[PDB]
């Protein structure tokens, strides 16, 4: 009975933390792809 | 199945999301066949400007 309490309280807070966490990786995911499109072009300009 | 269609459509999204990047930039490149909206941009053209 106790971990069935818990544990629904923590699943409610855990969706809700898991879409936040969703969200940050992606908006983490934008800058990522950004960021390795701007170093490939940046390199192939200096080199050439 | 859950949590993988989670993982599929999050990676779907995700796709989509570097799919509506590539949208904007070809909005943009389309409508940019008249004058550039900004000339900040030719400025970067060249390391003398």
């Known amino acids: 009975g106790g971990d069935k309490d818990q544990m629904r309280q923590e699943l409610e807070q855990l969706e809700k933390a898991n879409e936040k966490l969703r969200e940050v990786n992606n908006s983490l995911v934008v800058s990522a792809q950004d960021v390795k499109n701007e170093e490939r072009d940046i390199q192939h300009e200096r080199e050439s | ?49």
């Open chain 2, 1 to 49: 199945e859950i949590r993988d269609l989670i993982s599929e459509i999050d990676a779907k999204a995700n796709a989509i999301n570097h799919e509506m990047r590539s949208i904007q930039r070809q909005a943009e490149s389309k409508t940019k066949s008249l004058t550039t909206t900004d000339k900040i941009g030719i400025l970067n053209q060249d390391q003398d400007l």
